[PDB]
Amino acid sequence: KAIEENNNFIKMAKEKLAQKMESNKENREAHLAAMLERLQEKDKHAEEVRKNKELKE
Amino acid sequence: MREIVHIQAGQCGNQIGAKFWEVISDEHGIDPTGSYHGDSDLQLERINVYYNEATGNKYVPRAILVDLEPGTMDSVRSGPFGQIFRPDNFVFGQSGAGNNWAKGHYTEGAELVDSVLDVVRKESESCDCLQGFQLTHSLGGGTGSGMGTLLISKIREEYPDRIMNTFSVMPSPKVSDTVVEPYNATLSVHQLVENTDETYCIDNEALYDICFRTLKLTTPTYGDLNHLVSATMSGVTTCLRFPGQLNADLRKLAVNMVPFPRLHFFMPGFAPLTSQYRALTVPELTQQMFDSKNMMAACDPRHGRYLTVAAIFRGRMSMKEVDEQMLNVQNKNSSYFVEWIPNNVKTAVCDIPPRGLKMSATFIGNSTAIQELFKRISEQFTAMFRRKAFLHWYTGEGMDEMEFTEAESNMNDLVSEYQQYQDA
Numbered sequence: 001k002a003i004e005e006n007n008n009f010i011k012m013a014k015e016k017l018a019q020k021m022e023s024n025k026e027n028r029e030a031h032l033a034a035m036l037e038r039l040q041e042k043d044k045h046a047e048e049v050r051k052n053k054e055l056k057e
Numbered sequence: 058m059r060e061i062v063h064i065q066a067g068q069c070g071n072q073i074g075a076k077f078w079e080v081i082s083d084e085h086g087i088d089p090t091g092s093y094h095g096d097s098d099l100q101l102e103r104i105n106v107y108y109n110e111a112t113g114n115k116y117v118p119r120a121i122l123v124d125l126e127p128g129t130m131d132s133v134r135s136g137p138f139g140q141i142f143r144p145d146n147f148v149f150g151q152s153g154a155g156n157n158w159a160k161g162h163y164t165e166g167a168e169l170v171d172s173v174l175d176v177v178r179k180e181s182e183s184c185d186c187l188q189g190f191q192l193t194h195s196l197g198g199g200t201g202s203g204m205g206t207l208l209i210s211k212i213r214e215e216y217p218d219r220i221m222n223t224f225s226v227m228p229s230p231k232v233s234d235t236v237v238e239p240y241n242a243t244l245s246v247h248q249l250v251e252n253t254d255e256t257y258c259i260d261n262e263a264l265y266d267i268c269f270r271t272l273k274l275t276t277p278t279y280g281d282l283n284h285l286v287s288a289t290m291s292g293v294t295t296c297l298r299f300p301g302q303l304n305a306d307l308r309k310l311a312v313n314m315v316p317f318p319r320l321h322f323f324m325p326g327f328a329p330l331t332s333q334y335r336a337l338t339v340p341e342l343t344q345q346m347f348d349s350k351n352m353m354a355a356c357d358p359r360h361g362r363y364l365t366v367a368a369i370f371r372g373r374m375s376m377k378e379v380d381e382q383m384l385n386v387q388n389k390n391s392s393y394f395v396e397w398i399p400n401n402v403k404t405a406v407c408d409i410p411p412r413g414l415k416m417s418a419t420f421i422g423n424s425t426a427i428q429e430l431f432k433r434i435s436e437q438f439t440a441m442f443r444r445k446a447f448l449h450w451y452t453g454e455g456m457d458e459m460e461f462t463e464a465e466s467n468m469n470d471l472v473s474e475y476q477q478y479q480d481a
């Protein structure tokens with residue numbers, strides 16, 4: 001039982017840690033993905049601005 | 058039945074156990090390197106009880122030294138009589154037991170127990186007629202308490218017909234290393250109730266008070282407590298270590314002291330108490346050894362009744378006067394001796410006095426007042442256990458709360474059993 005509980009604690013610490021570090025990488029990447037997607041939306045807007053100058057002449 | 062195998066376990070066990078071999082080696086004329094330099098043939102007549110004979114006519118104690126850390130056993134080997142012990146009998150682990158019964162009994166000590174039993178078997182093998190085992194330990198720590206009781210349970214399996222006796226030092230807040238002592242002691246008491254034939258209840262409370270009140274030592278060390286212990290250890294082994302027309306072994310003595318199998322916890326005592334010039338008279342020895350102040354277990358014998366008493370007087374005195382004085386205290390205090398065991402006080406005299414004293418007396422009392430000792434440790438236990446305090450140290454090593462609940466109940470049963478014969 002001493003071994004069983006000592007192993008359980010090591011097991012669940014390792015699984016709790018791996019779940020957090022993977023959940024964190026998902027969240028950080030998704031936060032950076034949204035930031036770039038908003039910045040890439042400005043490039044698509046700036047392309048419509050430059051087209052509406054040439055298509056008005 | 059001549060040979061006894063001695064085992065000393067833990068810091069305490071090895072400390073008082075070292076003092077035992079210091080005192081008796083002096084009494085038998087054995088020097089620090091093992092050679093005989095006595096004068097009386099009585100010193101060699103029953104030397105086989107505690108010593109093996111070696112080449113060059115050397116005497117080696119039949120002694121096994123156990124601990125879960127090297128520390129204290131390195132101090133034994135360095136100490137005054139440490140060279141006399143057989144090097145193979147020093148059996149020790151490395152990690153210690155942190156005053157933890159569970160470590161001693163179930164994890165750390167389990168790893169070391171079998172190699173201790175190999176040394177026991179080695180000693181028991183070359184024994185013409187092994188009478189039994191004796192053990193020195195504390196019940197308050199981890200090794201002596203937890204492993205010492207584990208050894209006692211293993212020894213009983215392999216040697217179920219041999220006598221198991223212990224000197225078991227009981228913990229007290231007055232001389233206290235850790236708050237978990239009551240836990241360790243309660244777990245150990247249940248083991249001794251099952252697996253020992255006699256247990257000498259050395260109470261550190263009592264040894265402290267004797268050092269403080271009746272010896273005027275303001276700051277008593279463990280050596281001052283151990284001085285009182287070794288005087289008693291010598292006293293209880295006198296009738297086996299010498300003659301004098303007494304035809305008794307550990308079993309014969311056990312048969313006459315223990316009327317009920319579970320009630321084998323004795324109240325040791327010694328007169329005179331020392332730390333002298335005027336030798337005591339026989340009446341003084343008798344009054345002192347029966348006095349509560351001289352008791353090595355902090356109980357009041359007036360609060361119980363004596364089931365049996367044994368007293369062994371050392372020195373050159375009148376056996377007529379001993380008989381008279383021993384009969385005087387019984388017949389003048391007959392309420393405190395049970396009427397339903399006739400002639401329950403027995404006595405012996407040995408001509409050889411111990412070192413320093415011209416005449417002494419060692420008291421072995423099987424009184425029902427020892428319930429006070431077990432009640433005190435039961436109260437300390439429950440104070441913590443009702444809040445499950447400090448249990449994590451034990452559950453971490455695999456133990457359940459159930460085992461504590463059992464042990465609490467087993468000792469309270471012992472107390473109830475002592476109360477039964479006190480009112481009968």
Ligand SMILES: CC(C)(C)c1nc[nH]c1/C=c1\[nH]c(=O)/c(=C/c2cccc(C(=O)c3ccc(F)cc3)c2)[nH]c1=O
Nearest residue numbers: 191192222223224290293294296310367368403404405
């Ligand atoms: C007639 C007369 C008075 C002799 C008598 N009639 C009934 N009884 C008696 C006396 C004795 N009865 C005993 O049962 C006895 C027990 C005994 C013997 C040896 C060792 C240990 C022992 O636990 C020990 C000692 C040192 C140690 F390190 C670890 C353990 C106990 N000694 C006695 O002198």
Ligand SMILES: Nc1nc2c(ncn2[C@@H]2O[C@H](COP(=O)(O)OP(=O)(O)O)[C@@H](O)[C@H]2O)c(=O)[nH]1
Nearest residue numbers: 067068069072195197198199200201228232279
């Ligand atoms: N009388 C006496 N008691 C001791 C001695 N050493 C430790 N103790 C007591 O024993 C208990 C501690 O156990 P200890 O033997 O040090 O632990 P272990 O080495 O793990 O068995 C405490 O209750 C102390 O009061 C000693 O030399 N003499």
Ligand SMILES: [Ca+2]
Nearest residue numbers: 152164165168
């Ligand atoms: Ca280990």
Ligand SMILES: [Mg+2]
Nearest residue numbers: 068069198234
């Ligand atoms: Mg200690």
